[PDB]
């Protein structure tokens, strides 16, 4: 299991990705796409298929997509993501 953490400085903009998931607690939250020319793509830090285990230190284990969204809405200039490779 390859797990790593990345800290992204978004320079006032979005991370440049879309995540997908359900409200079923243990379903995984996955990175589904990368915006062309966006931060995620330019850094090459995260990719499609990657599972998000935590955001800003708050675990998503057994948490619905709505929780991930709640956290993202409170993201500051720097966002930390714990990633699990598929």
């Amino acid at each position: 299991a390859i797990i790593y953490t990345v800290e992204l400085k978004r320079y006032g903009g979005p991370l440049g990705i879309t995540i997908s998931g359900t409200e079923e607690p243990f379903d995984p939250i996955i990175i589904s796409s990368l915006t062309k020319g966006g931060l995620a793509e330019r850094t090459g830090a995260i990719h499609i298929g990657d599972r998000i285990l935590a955001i800003n230190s708050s675990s998503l284990k057994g948490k619905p997509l709505s929780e991930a969204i709640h956290l993202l809405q409170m993201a500051g200039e720097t966002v930390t993501l714990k990633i699990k490779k598929q």
């Binding site: 979005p14 991370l15 990705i17 879309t18 995540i19 997908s20 998931g21 359900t22 409200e23 079923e24 379903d27 589904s32 915006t35 997509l65 991930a68 969204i69 993202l72 993201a75």
Partner: peptide, 8 residues
């Protein structure tokens, strides 16, 4: 369950 997509 329903799968939703969120841009961020």
């Amino acid at each position: 369950a329903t799968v939703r997509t969120y841009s961020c």
